[PDB]
Symmetry: D2
């Protein structure tokens, strides 16, 4: 499993469950073409987005629908979403985990890369 | 000053100076309309981007050229840039301080609203 | 001002006002020597804690009474209080801004050094 | 396993491996008594710190030696450690995961509490 996203609710101290996640890859021109999508599970994790065969080198965009997450709890948050754009597998295939920590008025998204 | 953007360097622990920041506002037709842009000062802050009259209710995108920042420090980052999209003034005028803390593999952002 | 502490509320997106802050410095015998204290203002900032003459090299602890802050807001937090411990001025005097962002279950802290 | 700590290096984008972690519990007096300790694995996680029987109600402090971590990588750190003090099991037994994200000049620690 080369790409996984883990989302945590730092305000309620719990996993961010059922959060929509969309992944895109930049095509040769300059457009973002749909690559994969899914929703986080009860543990706040999202596995199986793609495979080693499909996940080639490229610039990828991971957009987390944090707004719907907060609205469902009755909160109108600051951000429309949490997004990370990064280059993947530029020095060979790696396993990537996008770890996102959420709060209504702030968030962090970091790319954890392993061999 | 209703909108101020601050950028910090998580690796060196200093203000990220001379960083390019672009701000866009989403139009009725769903497109991104250029709003204002500038570069952070020695304190890592960007003031004067807009006015109270100009900064109406809406969805705004702040795009930081984090990549050029790292390049100039001799670093080749994994993150391509940093983008923060937020809804502003939907409950009346407010002053916003949008801060972004950078690292080659991560960014954190905060919004202080008063 | 060589040391400034700023506290923010990640739940409401505002400065955390009237937050108690206590600073200690580790003594030669390993005990925490009271150094300075105060409360955040309406901007969530606390200035004037110390001076260039008193702020010597050493290991400092900034203890933030997050608990009392939440209580006043009708919230019984799981986090008891934040402790930010750092070494200061070990390569000469520097100006430090210690910021802490709070939630009932978490806190993030940053340090800008100039 | 009621208490787990996971540490991530948000600056190098990897798990923070072999990081020492010390856990204390405030005793009836007002002092921090040793409770448990360990080192993070290659995944940056530390399991088996305590048991359901031993982890009773109380105020606990979890101190992560980030200073040694950054030095071993040749990176000068700002903080002595990343820490979290919290009341645990005050409303019955819970599972606690301390998620800490690290950078030389900043850290975040959030208690993820589940049933």
């Amino acid at each position: 499993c080369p790409l996984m996203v883990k989302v945590l609710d730092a305000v309620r101290g719990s996993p961010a469950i059922n959060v929509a996640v969309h992944v895109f890859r930049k095509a040769a021109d300059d457009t973002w073409e749909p690559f994969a999508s899914g929703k986080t599970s009860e543990s706040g994790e999202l596995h199986g987005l793609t495979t080693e065969e499909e996940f080639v080198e490229g610039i990828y965009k991971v957009e987390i629908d944090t707004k719907s997450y907060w609205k469902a709890l009755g909160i109108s948050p600051m951000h429309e979403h949490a997004e990370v754009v990064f280059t993947a597998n530029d020095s060979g295939p790696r396993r990537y985990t996008i770890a996102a920590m959420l709060s209504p008025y702030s968030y962090s998204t970091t790319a954890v890369v392993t061999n």
